[model samples]
Target chain A: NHYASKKSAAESMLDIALLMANASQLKAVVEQGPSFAFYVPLVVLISISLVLQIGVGVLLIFLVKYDLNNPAKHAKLDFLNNLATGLVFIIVVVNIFITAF
Target chain B: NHYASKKSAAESMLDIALLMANASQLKAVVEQGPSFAFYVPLVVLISISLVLQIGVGVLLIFLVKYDLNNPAKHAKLDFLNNLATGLVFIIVVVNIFITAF
Candidate 1:
Protein backbone atom coordinates (compact mmCIF):
# COMPACT_ATOMS: atom_id res chain seq x y z
CA ASN A 1 0.00 0.00 0.00
CA HIS A 2 2.58 2.50 1.09
CA TYR A 3 4.84 1.27 -1.68
CA ALA A 4 2.25 1.85 -4.35
CA SER A 5 1.31 5.22 -2.92
CA LYS A 6 4.91 6.36 -2.79
CA LYS A 7 5.71 5.00 -6.22
CA SER A 8 2.70 6.70 -7.71
CA ALA A 9 3.68 9.97 -6.05
CA ALA A 10 7.14 9.63 -7.53
CA GLU A 11 5.83 8.89 -10.99
CA SER A 12 3.55 11.88 -10.73
CA MET A 13 6.53 14.08 -9.92
CA LEU A 14 8.43 12.80 -12.95
CA ASP A 15 5.42 13.33 -15.15
CA ILE A 16 5.08 16.92 -13.98
CA ALA A 17 8.77 17.51 -14.53
CA LEU A 18 8.66 16.24 -18.08
CA LEU A 19 5.54 18.26 -18.73
CA MET A 20 7.28 21.45 -17.66
CA ALA A 21 10.42 20.61 -19.58
CA ASN A 22 8.49 19.79 -22.75
CA ALA A 23 6.54 22.99 -22.40
CA SER A 24 9.73 24.97 -22.05
CA GLN A 25 10.98 23.28 -25.17
CA LEU A 26 7.78 24.18 -26.92
CA LYS A 27 8.17 27.81 -25.92
CA ALA A 28 11.69 27.83 -27.29
CA VAL A 29 10.58 26.18 -30.51
CA VAL A 30 7.81 28.70 -31.06
CA GLU A 31 10.17 31.55 -30.41
CA GLN A 32 12.50 30.13 -33.02
CA GLY A 33 9.62 30.64 -35.49
CA PRO A 34 8.35 28.42 -38.28
CA SER A 35 11.35 29.34 -40.38
CA PHE A 36 13.44 27.03 -38.21
CA ALA A 37 14.13 23.84 -40.15
CA PHE A 38 13.22 21.34 -37.41
CA TYR A 39 10.19 23.22 -36.16
CA VAL A 40 7.55 20.79 -37.35
CA PRO A 41 9.22 17.63 -36.09
CA LEU A 42 9.99 19.23 -32.75
CA VAL A 43 6.38 20.23 -32.28
CA VAL A 44 5.18 16.80 -33.33
CA LEU A 45 7.57 15.02 -31.00
CA ILE A 46 6.75 17.23 -28.06
CA SER A 47 3.02 16.82 -28.62
CA ILE A 48 3.29 13.06 -28.69
CA SER A 49 5.42 12.99 -25.57
CA LEU A 50 3.08 15.30 -23.70
CA VAL A 51 0.04 13.18 -24.57
CA LEU A 52 1.71 9.98 -23.46
CA GLN A 53 2.98 11.58 -20.27
CA ILE A 54 -0.56 12.67 -19.45
CA GLY A 55 -1.73 9.14 -20.02
CA VAL A 56 0.91 7.94 -17.59
CA GLY A 57 -0.32 10.43 -15.04
CA VAL A 58 -3.85 9.07 -15.35
CA LEU A 59 -2.52 5.53 -15.02
CA LEU A 60 -0.69 6.52 -11.83
CA ILE A 61 -3.90 7.94 -10.44
CA PHE A 62 -5.65 4.66 -11.20
CA LEU A 63 -2.86 2.68 -9.58
CA VAL A 64 -3.07 4.77 -6.43
CA LYS A 65 -6.86 4.55 -6.27
CA TYR A 66 -6.99 0.77 -6.49
CA ASP A 67 -6.45 -1.41 -3.44
CA LEU A 68 -3.19 -3.15 -4.18
CA ASN A 69 -3.55 -5.64 -1.36
CA ASN A 70 -6.60 -7.16 -2.94
CA PRO A 71 -5.28 -10.36 -4.46
CA ALA A 72 -7.87 -10.29 -7.22
CA LYS A 73 -6.66 -6.90 -8.36
CA HIS A 74 -3.00 -7.81 -8.46
CA ALA A 75 -3.05 -8.86 -12.08
CA LYS A 76 -4.75 -5.67 -13.18
CA LEU A 77 -2.41 -3.61 -11.03
CA ASP A 78 0.62 -5.28 -12.56
CA PHE A 79 -0.70 -4.60 -16.01
CA LEU A 80 -1.20 -0.95 -15.27
CA ASN A 81 2.22 -0.60 -13.70
CA ASN A 82 3.93 -2.26 -16.64
CA LEU A 83 2.02 -0.16 -19.09
CA ALA A 84 2.99 3.03 -17.29
CA THR A 85 6.64 2.03 -17.23
CA GLY A 86 6.66 1.30 -20.95
CA LEU A 87 5.03 4.60 -21.74
CA VAL A 88 7.49 6.43 -19.54
CA PHE A 89 10.35 4.77 -21.38
CA ILE A 90 9.03 6.09 -24.67
CA ILE A 91 8.47 9.51 -23.17
CA VAL A 92 12.07 9.64 -22.05
CA VAL A 93 13.37 8.77 -25.49
CA VAL A 94 11.14 11.30 -27.17
CA ASN A 95 12.15 14.00 -24.69
CA ILE A 96 15.79 13.23 -25.41
CA PHE A 97 15.23 14.03 -29.07
CA ILE A 98 13.25 17.09 -28.03
CA THR A 99 16.15 18.34 -25.95
CA ALA A 100 18.56 17.68 -28.79
CA PHE A 101 16.43 19.80 -31.07
CA ASN B 1 10.77 -0.06 5.39
CA HIS B 2 8.93 -0.32 2.08
CA TYR B 3 7.32 3.04 2.82
CA ALA B 4 10.64 4.76 3.32
CA SER B 5 12.16 3.13 0.28
CA LYS B 6 9.27 4.08 -1.92
CA LYS B 7 9.14 7.60 -0.58
CA SER B 8 12.85 8.01 -1.14
CA ALA B 9 12.57 6.69 -4.66
CA ALA B 10 9.84 9.22 -5.37
CA GLU B 11 11.86 12.08 -3.94
CA SER B 12 14.81 11.08 -6.09
CA MET B 13 12.65 11.22 -9.18
CA LEU B 14 11.59 14.74 -8.22
CA ASP B 15 15.18 15.75 -7.66
CA ILE B 16 16.15 14.55 -11.11
CA ALA B 17 13.25 16.38 -12.67
CA LEU B 18 14.18 19.68 -11.05
CA LEU B 19 17.80 19.25 -12.02
CA MET B 20 16.89 18.82 -15.66
CA ALA B 21 14.44 21.69 -15.63
CA ASN B 22 16.91 24.01 -13.94
CA ALA B 23 19.56 23.09 -16.46
CA SER B 24 17.20 23.92 -19.26
CA GLN B 25 16.51 27.25 -17.63
CA LEU B 26 20.22 27.87 -17.29
CA LYS B 27 20.79 27.19 -20.97
CA ALA B 28 18.00 29.57 -21.88
CA VAL B 29 19.39 32.23 -19.58
CA VAL B 30 22.86 31.91 -21.05
CA GLU B 31 21.59 32.17 -24.61
CA GLN B 32 19.73 35.33 -23.70
CA GLY B 33 23.17 36.80 -22.88
CA PRO B 34 24.03 39.46 -20.31
CA SER B 35 21.88 42.02 -22.03
CA PHE B 36 18.79 40.12 -20.90
CA ALA B 37 18.98 42.17 -17.67
CA PHE B 38 17.59 39.52 -15.27
CA TYR B 39 20.30 37.10 -16.39
CA VAL B 40 22.45 37.27 -13.27
CA PRO B 41 19.60 36.78 -10.77
CA LEU B 42 18.20 33.99 -12.87
CA VAL B 43 21.56 32.32 -12.86
CA VAL B 44 21.94 32.81 -9.11
CA LEU B 45 18.48 31.44 -8.32
CA ILE B 46 18.94 28.46 -10.62
CA SER B 47 22.35 27.77 -9.07
CA ILE B 48 20.94 27.93 -5.55
CA SER B 49 18.03 25.68 -6.47
CA LEU B 50 20.26 23.17 -8.21
CA VAL B 51 22.67 22.99 -5.25
CA LEU B 52 19.81 22.53 -2.82
CA GLN B 53 18.20 19.92 -5.02
CA ILE B 54 21.47 18.00 -5.10
CA GLY B 55 21.62 18.25 -1.32
CA VAL B 56 18.11 16.80 -1.12
CA GLY B 57 19.24 13.95 -3.35
CA VAL B 58 22.08 13.18 -0.94
CA LEU B 59 19.71 13.33 1.98
CA LEU B 60 17.42 10.89 0.18
CA ILE B 61 20.32 8.51 -0.46
CA PHE B 62 21.26 8.59 3.22
CA LEU B 63 17.61 7.96 4.06
CA VAL B 64 17.28 4.90 1.84
CA LYS B 65 20.62 3.49 3.03
CA TYR B 66 19.68 3.77 6.68
CA ASP B 67 17.76 0.91 8.26
CA LEU B 68 14.39 2.33 9.06
CA ASN B 69 13.49 -0.64 11.20
CA ASN B 70 16.14 0.33 13.71
CA PRO B 71 14.18 2.03 16.47
CA ALA B 72 17.15 4.06 17.67
CA LYS B 73 17.56 5.65 14.21
CA HIS B 74 14.01 6.93 14.01
CA ALA B 75 14.84 10.32 15.53
CA LYS B 76 17.68 10.90 13.09
CA LEU B 77 15.55 9.69 10.19
CA ASP B 78 12.77 12.03 11.19
CA PHE B 79 15.15 14.96 11.29
CA LEU B 80 16.56 14.13 7.86
CA ASN B 81 13.09 13.82 6.38
CA ASN B 82 12.03 17.17 7.80
CA LEU B 83 15.16 18.85 6.58
CA ALA B 84 14.78 17.44 3.09
CA THR B 85 11.15 18.51 2.93
CA GLY B 86 12.06 22.06 3.94
CA LEU B 87 14.79 22.21 1.31
CA VAL B 88 12.46 20.88 -1.36
CA PHE B 89 9.91 23.52 -0.47
CA ILE B 90 12.53 26.19 -0.99
CA ILE B 91 13.63 24.63 -4.24
CA VAL B 92 10.08 24.60 -5.53
CA VAL B 93 9.63 28.28 -4.68
CA VAL B 94 12.92 29.16 -6.32
CA ASN B 95 12.10 27.15 -9.43
CA ILE B 96 8.80 28.99 -9.71
CA PHE B 97 10.72 32.25 -9.80
CA ILE B 98 13.12 30.81 -12.34
CA THR B 99 10.22 29.84 -14.55
CA ALA B 100 8.60 33.23 -14.22
CA PHE B 101 11.81 34.90 -15.24
Candidate 2:
Protein backbone atom coordinates (compact mmCIF):
# COMPACT_ATOMS: atom_id res chain seq x y z
CA ASN A 1 0.00 0.00 0.00
CA HIS A 2 1.22 3.46 -0.89
CA TYR A 3 1.48 5.07 2.53
CA ALA A 4 1.53 8.67 1.34
CA SER A 5 2.95 9.64 4.71
CA LYS A 6 4.73 12.67 3.30
CA LYS A 7 1.72 14.01 1.44
CA SER A 8 -0.37 13.68 4.56
CA ALA A 9 2.32 15.39 6.59
CA ALA A 10 2.37 18.30 4.16
CA GLU A 11 -1.39 18.61 4.24
CA SER A 12 -1.32 18.66 8.01
CA MET A 13 1.29 21.40 8.08
CA LEU A 14 -0.65 23.47 5.59
CA ASP A 15 -3.73 23.04 7.72
CA ILE A 16 -1.95 24.33 10.80
CA ALA A 17 -0.55 27.35 8.98
CA LEU A 18 -3.94 28.32 7.60
CA LEU A 19 -5.54 27.87 10.99
CA MET A 20 -3.10 30.32 12.54
CA ALA A 21 -3.54 32.78 9.71
CA ASN A 22 -7.31 32.66 9.96
CA ALA A 23 -7.07 33.15 13.68
CA SER A 24 -4.94 36.22 13.16
CA GLN A 25 -7.34 37.61 10.61
CA LEU A 26 -10.27 36.99 12.92
CA LYS A 27 -8.52 38.72 15.77
CA ALA A 28 -7.70 41.76 13.64
CA VAL A 29 -11.19 42.10 12.26
CA VAL A 30 -12.85 41.75 15.62
CA GLU A 31 -10.40 44.12 17.21
CA GLN A 32 -11.34 46.66 14.56
CA GLY A 33 -14.96 45.96 15.57
CA PRO A 34 -18.09 46.76 13.60
CA SER A 35 -17.31 50.45 13.65
CA PHE A 36 -14.70 49.86 10.96
CA ALA A 37 -16.08 50.55 7.48
CA PHE A 38 -15.18 47.19 5.94
CA TYR A 39 -15.77 45.27 9.16
CA VAL A 40 -18.69 43.17 7.97
CA PRO A 41 -17.02 42.03 4.76
CA LEU A 42 -13.77 41.18 6.46
CA VAL A 43 -15.56 39.12 9.05
CA VAL A 44 -17.44 37.32 6.33
CA LEU A 45 -14.27 36.50 4.49
CA ILE A 46 -12.58 35.23 7.61
CA SER A 47 -15.59 33.13 8.53
CA ILE A 48 -15.70 31.54 5.10
CA SER A 49 -12.02 30.77 5.15
CA LEU A 50 -12.16 29.43 8.67
CA VAL A 51 -14.94 27.04 7.80
CA LEU A 52 -13.17 25.90 4.65
CA GLN A 53 -9.95 25.50 6.59
CA ILE A 54 -11.70 23.20 8.99
CA GLY A 55 -12.96 21.18 6.05
CA VAL A 56 -9.42 20.85 4.78
CA GLY A 57 -8.29 19.71 8.19
CA VAL A 58 -10.91 17.01 8.19
CA LEU A 59 -9.91 15.93 4.74
CA LEU A 60 -6.32 15.71 5.87
CA ILE A 61 -7.26 13.37 8.66
CA PHE A 62 -9.15 11.17 6.26
CA LEU A 63 -6.34 11.18 3.76
CA VAL A 64 -3.81 10.22 6.36
CA LYS A 65 -5.86 7.28 7.53
CA TYR A 66 -6.70 5.96 4.07
CA ASP A 67 -4.31 3.57 2.39
CA LEU A 68 -3.24 5.00 -0.93
CA ASN A 69 -1.55 1.82 -2.24
CA ASN A 70 -4.82 0.18 -3.08
CA PRO A 71 -5.65 0.81 -6.70
CA ALA A 72 -9.33 0.96 -5.88
CA LYS A 73 -8.87 3.89 -3.54
CA HIS A 74 -6.81 5.99 -5.91
CA ALA A 75 -9.81 7.77 -7.39
CA LYS A 76 -11.18 8.74 -4.01
CA LEU A 77 -7.81 9.95 -2.83
CA ASP A 78 -7.36 12.04 -5.95
CA PHE A 79 -10.75 13.64 -5.49
CA LEU A 80 -9.96 14.48 -1.90
CA ASN A 81 -6.62 15.90 -2.91
CA ASN A 82 -8.22 18.10 -5.54
CA LEU A 83 -10.91 19.23 -3.16
CA ALA A 84 -8.43 20.15 -0.48
CA THR A 85 -6.24 22.04 -2.95
CA GLY A 86 -9.17 24.02 -4.30
CA LEU A 87 -10.40 24.88 -0.84
CA VAL A 88 -6.93 25.92 0.26
CA PHE A 89 -6.56 28.13 -2.82
CA ILE A 90 -9.85 29.84 -2.09
CA ILE A 91 -8.88 30.31 1.54
CA VAL A 92 -5.54 31.84 0.57
CA VAL A 93 -7.18 34.32 -1.80
CA VAL A 94 -9.90 35.14 0.70
CA ASN A 95 -7.34 35.76 3.42
CA ILE A 96 -5.36 38.02 1.08
CA PHE A 97 -8.48 40.10 0.57
CA ILE A 98 -9.10 40.06 4.28
CA THR A 99 -5.60 41.33 4.92
CA ALA A 100 -6.04 44.02 2.30
CA PHE A 101 -9.19 45.25 3.90
CA ASN B 1 17.04 6.60 -4.38
CA HIS B 2 14.66 7.97 -1.78
CA TYR B 3 13.52 11.11 -3.59
CA ALA B 4 11.61 12.45 -0.59
CA SER B 5 9.24 14.12 -3.01
CA LYS B 6 6.37 14.26 -0.57
CA LYS B 7 8.43 15.68 2.29
CA SER B 8 9.69 18.42 0.03
CA ALA B 9 6.17 19.09 -1.13
CA ALA B 10 5.09 19.53 2.46
CA GLU B 11 7.92 21.91 3.18
CA SER B 12 7.10 23.98 0.12
CA MET B 13 3.47 24.21 1.16
CA LEU B 14 4.50 25.32 4.64
CA ASP B 15 6.80 27.98 3.23
CA ILE B 16 3.99 29.42 1.14
CA ALA B 17 1.62 29.46 4.08
CA LEU B 18 4.07 31.24 6.32
CA LEU B 19 4.93 33.76 3.64
CA MET B 20 1.27 34.73 3.35
CA ALA B 21 0.86 34.87 7.10
CA ASN B 22 3.90 37.08 7.50
CA ALA B 23 2.68 39.40 4.77
CA SER B 24 -0.65 39.77 6.51
CA GLN B 25 1.01 40.48 9.82
CA LEU B 26 3.29 43.04 8.24
CA LYS B 27 0.34 44.78 6.62
CA ALA B 28 -1.57 44.92 9.87
CA VAL B 29 1.34 46.15 11.93
CA VAL B 30 2.33 48.78 9.36
CA GLU B 31 -1.23 49.94 8.99
CA GLN B 32 -1.25 50.38 12.73
CA GLY B 33 1.90 52.48 12.28
CA PRO B 34 4.50 53.32 14.87
CA SER B 35 1.96 54.91 17.10
CA PHE B 36 0.68 51.49 18.08
CA ALA B 37 1.93 50.56 21.54
CA PHE B 38 3.44 47.22 20.55
CA TYR B 39 4.50 48.27 17.09
CA VAL B 40 8.20 47.83 17.67
CA PRO B 41 7.98 44.35 19.12
CA LEU B 42 5.48 43.19 16.55
CA VAL B 43 7.66 44.46 13.76
CA VAL B 44 10.66 42.75 15.25
CA LEU B 45 8.82 39.47 15.55
CA ILE B 46 7.52 39.70 12.01
CA SER B 47 10.93 40.56 10.63
CA ILE B 48 12.58 37.64 12.35
CA SER B 49 9.95 35.25 11.14
CA LEU B 50 10.16 36.58 7.60
CA VAL B 51 13.90 36.09 7.47
CA LEU B 52 13.63 32.63 8.95
CA GLN B 53 10.86 31.79 6.54
CA ILE B 54 13.09 32.77 3.64
CA GLY B 55 15.82 30.57 5.02
CA VAL B 56 13.39 27.70 5.24
CA GLY B 57 12.34 28.33 1.67
CA VAL B 58 15.92 28.22 0.53
CA LEU B 59 16.52 24.98 2.41
CA LEU B 60 13.41 23.55 0.82
CA ILE B 61 14.75 24.31 -2.64
CA PHE B 62 18.00 22.60 -1.83
CA LEU B 63 16.15 19.65 -0.37
CA VAL B 64 13.94 19.27 -3.40
CA LYS B 65 16.95 19.35 -5.70
CA TYR B 66 19.12 17.01 -3.66
CA ASP B 67 19.40 13.31 -4.29
CA LEU B 68 18.12 11.79 -1.08
CA ASN B 69 18.91 8.27 -2.25
CA ASN B 70 22.64 8.78 -1.81
CA PRO B 71 23.85 7.57 1.57
CA ALA B 72 26.41 10.33 1.72
CA LYS B 73 23.78 13.01 1.30
CA HIS B 74 21.37 11.62 3.88
CA ALA B 75 23.15 13.24 6.82
CA LYS B 76 23.11 16.65 5.18
CA LEU B 77 19.49 16.21 4.24
CA ASP B 78 18.65 15.26 7.79
CA PHE B 79 20.42 18.33 9.11
CA LEU B 80 18.56 20.56 6.70
CA ASN B 81 15.27 18.92 7.64
CA ASN B 82 15.94 19.45 11.33
CA LEU B 83 17.00 23.03 10.77
CA ALA B 84 13.96 23.75 8.66
CA THR B 85 11.68 22.20 11.24
CA GLY B 86 13.24 24.18 14.07
CA LEU B 87 12.98 27.41 12.15
CA VAL B 88 9.38 26.72 11.20
CA PHE B 89 8.45 25.99 14.79
CA ILE B 90 10.01 29.24 15.93
CA ILE B 91 8.32 31.15 13.16
CA VAL B 92 4.96 29.65 14.01
CA VAL B 93 5.23 30.61 17.65
CA VAL B 94 6.53 34.07 16.83
CA ASN B 95 3.72 34.67 14.36
CA ILE B 96 1.21 33.61 16.96
CA PHE B 97 2.56 36.25 19.28
CA ILE B 98 2.55 38.76 16.45
CA THR B 99 -1.09 37.97 15.82
CA ALA B 100 -1.87 38.34 19.47
CA PHE B 101 -0.26 41.71 19.65
Candidate 3:
Protein backbone atom coordinates (compact mmCIF):
# COMPACT_ATOMS: atom_id res chain seq x y z
CA ASN A 1 0.00 0.00 0.00
CA HIS A 2 1.17 3.52 -0.81
CA TYR A 3 1.44 6.23 1.81
CA ALA A 4 -0.56 9.44 1.29
CA SER A 5 -1.15 12.68 3.15
CA LYS A 6 -3.42 14.99 5.12
CA LYS A 7 -4.57 16.95 2.07
CA SER A 8 -7.45 15.70 -0.12
CA ALA A 9 -7.13 12.08 -1.19
CA ALA A 10 -6.92 12.82 -4.91
CA GLU A 11 -4.07 15.24 -4.30
CA SER A 12 -2.25 12.74 -2.13
CA MET A 13 -2.47 10.18 -4.89
CA LEU A 14 -1.07 12.57 -7.45
CA ASP A 15 1.78 13.45 -5.12
CA ILE A 16 2.63 9.79 -4.68
CA ALA A 17 2.70 9.39 -8.45
CA LEU A 18 5.07 12.34 -8.84
CA LEU A 19 7.38 10.99 -6.16
CA MET A 20 7.54 7.64 -7.87
CA ALA A 21 8.37 9.20 -11.22
CA ASN A 22 11.57 10.81 -9.88
CA ALA A 23 14.79 9.36 -11.34
CA SER A 24 15.67 5.97 -9.89
CA GLN A 25 18.92 7.27 -8.34
CA LEU A 26 17.11 10.11 -6.65
CA LYS A 27 14.42 7.78 -5.44
CA ALA A 28 17.14 5.51 -4.01
CA VAL A 29 18.67 8.52 -2.26
CA VAL A 30 15.36 9.29 -0.61
CA GLU A 31 14.48 5.67 -0.02
CA GLN A 32 17.89 4.54 1.13
CA GLY A 33 18.03 7.49 3.51
CA PRO A 34 17.61 7.10 7.22
CA SER A 35 16.77 10.78 7.63
CA PHE A 36 13.33 12.12 8.56
CA ALA A 37 14.59 15.68 7.95
CA PHE A 38 15.25 14.95 4.26
CA TYR A 39 11.80 13.48 3.65
CA VAL A 40 10.03 16.37 5.42
CA PRO A 41 10.79 19.09 2.85
CA LEU A 42 9.48 16.91 0.05
CA VAL A 43 6.26 16.51 1.99
CA VAL A 44 5.92 20.24 2.44
CA LEU A 45 6.56 21.05 -1.22
CA ILE A 46 3.99 18.48 -2.30
CA SER A 47 1.39 20.04 -0.04
CA ILE A 48 2.07 23.45 -1.51
CA SER A 49 1.82 22.17 -5.07
CA LEU A 50 -1.51 20.60 -4.29
CA VAL A 51 -3.21 23.81 -3.18
CA LEU A 52 -1.81 25.77 -6.10
CA GLN A 53 -3.21 23.16 -8.43
CA ILE A 54 -6.91 23.90 -7.86
CA GLY A 55 -7.78 27.36 -9.16
CA VAL A 56 -10.46 29.40 -7.41
CA GLY A 57 -10.68 32.90 -8.90
CA VAL A 58 -10.87 31.57 -12.46
CA LEU A 59 -14.07 29.92 -11.34
CA LEU A 60 -15.80 33.27 -11.59
CA ILE A 61 -15.30 33.71 -15.35
CA PHE A 62 -17.29 30.53 -15.75
CA LEU A 63 -20.24 32.04 -13.94
CA VAL A 64 -21.48 33.63 -17.09
CA LYS A 65 -21.09 32.66 -20.73
CA TYR A 66 -22.05 35.91 -22.43
CA ASP A 67 -21.93 36.66 -26.12
CA LEU A 68 -19.41 39.22 -27.30
CA ASN A 69 -20.85 39.61 -30.76
CA ASN A 70 -24.32 40.04 -29.34
CA PRO A 71 -24.64 40.95 -25.68
CA ALA A 72 -28.18 39.65 -25.60
CA LYS A 73 -27.02 36.16 -26.55
CA HIS A 74 -24.77 33.55 -24.91
CA ALA A 75 -21.88 31.40 -26.14
CA LYS A 76 -20.41 27.90 -25.60
CA LEU A 77 -17.02 28.85 -24.26
CA ASP A 78 -17.12 29.97 -20.67
CA PHE A 79 -13.41 30.65 -20.09
CA LEU A 80 -13.08 33.52 -22.54
CA ASN A 81 -15.80 35.86 -21.46
CA ASN A 82 -15.90 39.46 -20.32
CA LEU A 83 -15.69 37.64 -17.00
CA ALA A 84 -12.17 36.70 -18.10
CA THR A 85 -11.46 40.38 -18.21
CA GLY A 86 -10.30 39.51 -14.67
CA LEU A 87 -6.99 38.61 -16.29
CA VAL A 88 -6.48 42.22 -17.26
CA PHE A 89 -6.48 43.00 -13.56
CA ILE A 90 -3.75 40.42 -12.93
CA ILE A 91 -1.66 41.89 -15.73
CA VAL A 92 -1.84 45.38 -14.28
CA VAL A 93 -0.90 44.23 -10.79
CA VAL A 94 2.05 42.11 -11.97
CA ASN A 95 3.39 45.06 -13.98
CA ILE A 96 3.29 47.40 -11.03
CA PHE A 97 4.75 44.95 -8.52
CA ILE A 98 7.64 44.07 -10.82
CA THR A 99 8.34 47.75 -11.47
CA ALA A 100 7.92 48.83 -7.84
CA PHE A 101 9.71 46.09 -5.92
CA ASN B 1 -12.38 28.76 -31.22
CA HIS B 2 -11.87 32.59 -31.04
CA TYR B 3 -13.98 35.56 -30.71
CA ALA B 4 -13.13 37.59 -33.96
CA SER B 5 -14.12 34.93 -36.56
CA LYS B 6 -14.49 31.37 -37.70
CA LYS B 7 -11.83 29.70 -39.93
CA SER B 8 -10.12 26.83 -38.08
CA ALA B 9 -10.19 22.97 -37.82
CA ALA B 10 -10.22 22.49 -34.01
CA GLU B 11 -12.99 25.01 -33.77
CA SER B 12 -15.00 23.14 -36.38
CA MET B 13 -14.76 19.76 -34.56
CA LEU B 14 -15.77 21.19 -31.20
CA ASP B 15 -18.64 22.87 -32.99
CA ILE B 16 -19.92 19.54 -34.21
CA ALA B 17 -19.66 17.82 -30.77
CA LEU B 18 -21.59 20.59 -29.08
CA LEU B 19 -24.29 20.42 -31.72
CA MET B 20 -24.73 16.75 -30.88
CA ALA B 21 -25.24 17.25 -27.11
CA ASN B 22 -28.59 19.04 -27.36
CA ALA B 23 -31.70 17.25 -26.11
CA SER B 24 -32.77 14.74 -28.70
CA GLN B 25 -36.35 13.86 -29.82
CA LEU B 26 -36.44 17.66 -30.08
CA LYS B 27 -33.31 16.81 -32.05
CA ALA B 28 -35.50 15.09 -34.61
CA VAL B 29 -37.33 18.32 -35.41
CA VAL B 30 -33.87 19.29 -36.57
CA GLU B 31 -33.11 15.83 -37.97
CA GLN B 32 -36.26 15.89 -40.02
CA GLY B 33 -34.92 19.39 -39.98
CA PRO B 34 -35.72 23.10 -40.54
CA SER B 35 -32.53 23.60 -38.79
CA PHE B 36 -30.70 26.67 -39.88
CA ALA B 37 -33.51 28.73 -38.43
CA PHE B 38 -33.19 27.07 -34.99
CA TYR B 39 -29.49 26.23 -35.27
CA VAL B 40 -28.24 29.76 -35.74
CA PRO B 41 -29.14 30.68 -32.17
CA LEU B 42 -27.89 27.34 -30.85
CA VAL B 43 -24.54 27.75 -32.60
CA VAL B 44 -23.94 31.07 -30.97
CA LEU B 45 -24.76 29.71 -27.48
CA ILE B 46 -22.51 26.67 -27.85
CA SER B 47 -19.44 28.54 -29.06
CA ILE B 48 -19.57 30.69 -25.97
CA SER B 49 -19.58 27.71 -23.61
CA LEU B 50 -16.49 26.08 -25.15
CA VAL B 51 -14.16 29.02 -24.67
CA LEU B 52 -15.19 29.37 -21.06
CA GLN B 53 -14.34 25.70 -20.41
CA ILE B 54 -10.60 26.43 -20.52
CA GLY B 55 -9.13 28.13 -17.47
CA VAL B 56 -6.44 30.54 -18.67
CA GLY B 57 -6.71 33.55 -16.40
CA VAL B 58 -6.14 32.54 -12.79
CA LEU B 59 -2.97 30.58 -13.46
CA LEU B 60 -0.77 33.19 -11.78
CA ILE B 61 -1.67 32.17 -8.25
CA PHE B 62 0.10 28.87 -8.86
CA LEU B 63 3.42 30.00 -10.31
CA VAL B 64 5.21 30.53 -6.99
CA LYS B 65 4.45 28.48 -3.95
CA TYR B 66 5.81 30.43 -1.02
CA ASP B 67 5.46 29.69 2.68
CA LEU B 68 2.87 32.07 4.04
CA ASN B 69 3.67 31.25 7.66
CA ASN B 70 7.31 32.23 7.23
CA PRO B 71 8.03 35.67 5.76
CA ALA B 72 11.81 35.48 5.43
CA LYS B 73 11.66 32.97 2.52
CA HIS B 74 9.51 30.94 0.12
CA ALA B 75 6.36 29.10 1.10
CA LYS B 76 4.18 26.22 -0.03
CA LEU B 77 1.18 28.28 -1.02
CA ASP B 78 1.30 30.81 -3.87
CA PHE B 79 -1.76 32.62 -2.62
CA LEU B 80 -2.57 34.44 0.61
CA ASN B 81 0.50 36.47 -0.23
CA ASN B 82 1.06 40.12 -0.92
CA LEU B 83 0.79 38.78 -4.48
CA ALA B 84 -2.77 37.65 -3.92
CA THR B 85 -3.52 41.21 -3.03
CA GLY B 86 -4.00 41.42 -6.79
CA LEU B 87 -7.31 40.01 -5.77
CA VAL B 88 -7.51 43.30 -3.96
CA PHE B 89 -7.78 44.90 -7.39
CA ILE B 90 -10.55 42.52 -8.30
CA ILE B 91 -12.35 43.28 -5.08
CA VAL B 92 -12.01 46.95 -5.81
CA VAL B 93 -13.23 46.65 -9.38
CA VAL B 94 -16.14 44.46 -8.50
CA ASN B 95 -17.02 46.86 -5.70
CA ILE B 96 -16.94 49.87 -7.98
CA PHE B 97 -18.82 48.15 -10.78
CA ILE B 98 -21.53 47.08 -8.44
CA THR B 99 -21.77 50.44 -6.77
CA ALA B 100 -21.37 52.69 -9.77
CA PHE B 101 -23.60 50.68 -12.04
Per residue, candidate 2 scores C-alpha lDDT tens digits across A43-101 of 46546656565655665455554344553343343344344444444544554555555
Quality class of the docking in candidate 3, CAPRI style: incorrect
Using lDDT as the measure, name the better of candidate 1 and candidate 3: 1
Can you write out model 1's per-residue Cα lDDT over A2-41, one digit (the tens) per residue?
1322222323434334556656767887777664544555
Candidate 1 lDDT (Cα, whole model)? 0.50
| Candidate 2 segments exceeding 4 Å error | A1-17, A24-42, A50-58, A64-85, A99-101, B1-12, B16-101
- Best candidate per TM-score, number? 2
Provide DockQ values for all models, in the order shown. 0.03, 0.03, 0.02
lDDT of 2 at B23: 61
lDDT of 2 by residue, B12-79 (tens): 33434455665676688768666454444533543454445445555544454435568877677678
What is the per-residue lDDT of model 3 for residues A1-101, given as tens digits with 9 covering 90 to 100? 23454343444223222233223335766568765434444544344334322332233234332224442222322233233333223322333433344
RMSD of 1: 13.4
